[PDB]
């Protein structure tokens, strides 16, 4: 949904730039450049806020999927060390269990 | 927590982080880290003796629980702009600092020395407790809520007061600025309600 | 379609931007009562377990500092007898605050510090109990569960009574205990624009009960019919059955008040009727029928409605047609 | 803001190497047959442990690794957001300037 | 053969509710249910709640003592879980001491068994909660005020006579105690079968009866026995009442409701009565009940419902109003 | 100088009662006064009441043992009146145990001395009475609802503007909590030093003000912030408020009193505010506050007191009747 919102929000932005270049004389004639700049800020802000949420979603995933990985490291290291003291893993597979 | 189960004002409520919100969390995380080191040392030392020697780590184990609640308790006082409850927090930092310092100086009387880790961690805890104490006092200096007749109250920022602002990353507790916890509600909402410009 | 108040009270309005200054928790004793019973049991348990354990550390530490904790011959006189471990310190904390007082762990006279704590624990123990009892009594007198036995019909009807249109309604009481000083109010919730162009989102206009004496007081034993005579001063004066569809900006709020005869505590029963919950031109079936020794209310027919011969025109047209005929 | 993103990245880069050092530390302690030996020095009878003996226990390094991993993977992600948010704002302030 | 009243002469709403679709609402409100019960019923629930709580933990303490090994009748090799427990009688007696907090001390909790400490905590919290709940219900039964309402007294039969030319439905109410009822407020309703022009048939319709007070309000100051009369105006539902249709089997009844808080407990009360058609004496009056004495006023309650006959029209107010206008 | 307020923006009537011919009525209501005290002050009276009570009987127990000869140094032949009393400190500890009912039992009450049996009876009766007194005061303190009125909220300044042709003194009142105030009520009064044609001078005349309710009553339903306006008809005392004399030193004030029983506790509460002359803005409306959400409404309490400019005549309501009549 964010990526769909990421793309569909930047298509009106590039078209808005193209149409301003197409009819620059008309816009200055009506003295409507005050409104069109305000449209740009509305067009740009929608594009940025769609991207900011996309970045946050990636950051939300990456932090959560790395505390899970960190929890694996502690669990794997704890059992591997204990199994290297009683089952005598001989510290060989322990390294592979960590790297 | 029992009221939060049936609390609707927190549906869109605003907040106001107290002066020193960042210096509180960075100290707390440092404090939590060192308390784990004391736990590690305490459980390390008692393994040679025939007895448990619970006084090595359980005092530190209780501190780690107390430190965690001290920031949960502080946060609940940060979301609800009621600084008066910080007196209980202020007493804790004053009391913990005094008792820990007495322990630290008594190590020096017996000539523990920096060569022992417990002397280093105890000395470190005095600084962390002292700095956290100054943070609580600095809250009173800027909020002026305990003694001063005219409190200098602070209002939530204008951009936060908007109901039309939902990217609350710039204004959240420092732990949610790192773990992006505030996104959890938005992510769950995406499953039921599709994400549009609304 | 957003509801003003649900069919069972429970106002469906969510507040925003509440700039709380701690007044949420400053009303601690109101908050404690509002909490559900399972939460109250947790707070009841925690408030006492923490008090017992806070002074458990005090008794354990005092006997530690005094030096009678050392497992040796009792050369000295113990500060508090029989305190051997923190378990004994915890049990002695239970005995003092809950006033069990087994007496195996006495308080000796040779500990001036311990006598102070025995004073403090009793005063804190007495103060906690009195505060906790008061919260429970205000929870035992809660009458929000009694207000759930005050019943309103699912859908209200509009029909002619005595030649004038009115908005009828049936409200009943289930329990046999009378609700004293009953008082019924009715309001219309609709967006209102003034001639000056105002924008009032949820405007509440009070509705008279059409009681014979003007007041709101009602005597609820049998399920009474509550109706609003739609005169020229009513906000419903231009309602047609055509505009009674689902998505119509209309809602009638009915608030029944009164003091419960048992606990003496006032109650409210809130119900609302949306436009799609109105039934134009229908009549409420008879409910009370006399029996051999008494009357009888057959609640199975509480909300049953039957069609009535009524004009399909608005109240204004009904008045206008009467005006032309006169 | 660009400096803040760099500060997080510099610290997360340094904390990233704690993994290899913990892996080296954990296995090296497990590469020794003698586990009967233990930290041994006394002041009262509580047997205070020293610095080097503290970072020789395998379980200590795994726990410190777990704490270090949380910091590294949180500083690193926070480094991305600060860099990205500045980048989005740079785009927002440059599109307006161009327009 | 028999007539069915709406409310008896001492309140007691005489309506049978049937086909109540039960959802447990009777039992979900335990606390108000307990208060409504009589006192001998309350004591049984009071006793059973305590007796069961003592006995439930009596089974627990005996079971704990059995499992800990200190129930063996032998030498004291070990430390008992709770001392001086030698039977279920000792365990049951110990349970009373803990929950009632008598604490004799012969049966004392030791620090050996941690389970007893947890059970001792549970019994104290349960013991405290039952006491707190039982006290709350007892206070609401001590603050009960329905018994005071039984001293509010209404005349046996009400009368209809002429007051200031207009016809009115008189009635006498009195207060027997010496404690005032704060902000008394008396409502009158007439319960009669009636049909609407549109075809409605309301079985027992309740139409409010104005009391004709000096300010048009309802509050009455009740010290001496007042005479509560409703002035029968052109809007009154009794506007067409005549002695011809004032006989026994007439669907006519006047409910009277006397509200007002009791000054002592602060609890609002209510007093209810009704007057069947045969319980009305048309064209009579209430004798003067108050006579000034050497020091103060007097109230001769022996002359409470004594009514005497006086000249009076034998026609309804509707006929009387027409005669007044025509004359 | 300054302009006094009859009631401040948060209640707190600024009226100074003077020359009070005090007959001790302050102290006769000890139970009412005890509740009125602040919580820190209550603890002092709570603590000093128990502490003195223990210490009052500490002297009694010590004197009894002194007279009986128990505290004579040495293991005497006599049976002690109260066991293990070997100091006033022991007497103090035994005083605490009896009244608090801890009853450790190292200091028993023997069967020898009958004077101590009476004192044991007296201390228990005093202990039960004082505890019962303190429980009642704390229950009414825990049932206090004055702090609930702190959550009842009024707009900083009210407005006078147009609504359905007429001129109304609008206002806004909101409830921040989620609990309801059952049977709400609004009384508005205008306070002005009003003279009379007869020659009387009333230093602060309080004239009631209708609330312009739909049914001509006072009951309001407070769930979302409402507008409590008063239509300025021919009888309204504000009929001659010109915008010119709305300045600071104008003898004008509108008292607003919101009353209703709190649903949580059942205690009635009042919320009072006063709008001075400078706290009324002519010709301004209140912004729409209640928005709509997906399935609920939304109150923007940020915009609780925001007022916008609205066109209106700048003439008195008296001139509105004349202008309309001429037109």
Curated annotation (Swiss-Prot), chain A:
Top-level taxon in the UniProt lineage: Eukaryota
TM annotation in the entry: 63-78
Regions of this protein lying in the Extracellular compartment: 79-94
Cytoplasmic side: 1-62
Localization, UniProt: Cell membrane
Family membership: Belongs to the ABC transporter superfamily. ABCC family. Conjugate transporter (TC 3.A.1.208) subfamily.
Assembly: Forms an heterooctamer with KCNJ11; four ABCC8/SUR1 molecules interact with one KCNJ11 homotetramer.
Role of this protein: Regulator subunit of pancreatic ATP-sensitive potassium channel (KATP), playing a major role in the regulation of insulin release. In pancreatic cells, it forms KATP channels with KCNJ11; KCNJ11 forms the channel pore while ABCC8 is required for activation and regulation.
The protein's name in its UniProt record: ATP-binding cassette sub-family C member 8
Gene of this entry: ABCC8
First and last residues shown, out of full length: 1188 to 1286 of 1582
UniProtKB/Swiss-Prot annotation, chain B:
Residue intervals passing through the bilayer: 23-39, 57-73, 87-103, 120-136
Function description: Regulator subunit of pancreatic ATP-sensitive potassium channel (KATP), playing a major role in the regulation of insulin release. In pancreatic cells, it forms KATP channels with KCNJ11; KCNJ11 forms the channel pore while ABCC8 is required for activation and regulation.
Spans within the Cytoplasmic topological domain: 1-22, 74-86
Name of this protein: ATP-binding cassette sub-family C member 8
Shown stretch of the complete protein: 51 to 248 of 1582
Extracellular compartment residues: 40-56, 104-119
Lineage: Eukaryota, Metazoa, Chordata, Craniata, Vertebrata
Cellular compartment(s): Cell membrane
Family in the record: Belongs to the ABC transporter superfamily. ABCC family. Conjugate transporter (TC 3.A.1.208) subfamily.
Organism name: Cricetus cricetus
Subunit comment: Forms an heterooctamer with KCNJ11; four ABCC8/SUR1 molecules interact with one KCNJ11 homotetramer.
Curated annotation (Swiss-Prot), chain C:
Keywords: ATP-binding, Disulfide bond, Ion channel, Ion transport, Membrane, Metal-binding, Nucleotide-binding, Phosphoprotein, Potassium, Potassium transport, Transmembrane, Transmembrane helix, Transport, Voltage-gated channel
Disulfide bond residue pairs: 79-111
Top-level taxon in the UniProt lineage: Eukaryota
Regulation: KATP channels are regulated by cytoplasmic ATP/ADP ratios; ATP inhibits the channel by closing the pore, while ADP activates the channel. Activated by phosphatidylinositol 4,5-biphosphate (PtdIns(4,5)P2).
Binding locations of K(+) 2: 102
PTM summary: Phosphorylation by MAPK1 results in changes in channel gating that destabilize the closed states and reduce the ATP sensitivity.
Motif position, Selectivity filter: 99-104
Catalytic reaction list: K(+)(in) = K(+)(out)
Binding site for K(+) 1: 99
A single BP term in Gene Ontology: ventricular cardiac muscle tissue development
Family under the similarity heading: Belongs to the inward rectifier-type potassium channel (TC 1.A.2.1) family. KCNJ11 subfamily.
Free-text function comment from the UniProt entry: Inward rectifier potassium channel that forms the pore of ATP-sensitive potassium channels (KATP), regulating potassium permeability as a function of cytoplasmic ATP and ADP concentrations in many different cells. Inward rectifier potassium channels are characterized by a greater tendency to allow potassium to flow into the cell rather than out of it. Their voltage dependence is regulated by the concentration of extracellular potassium; as external potassium is raised, the voltage range of the channel opening shifts to more positive voltages.
Protein name from the UniProt record: ATP-sensitive inward rectifier potassium channel 11
Species in which this protein is naturally found: Rattus norvegicus
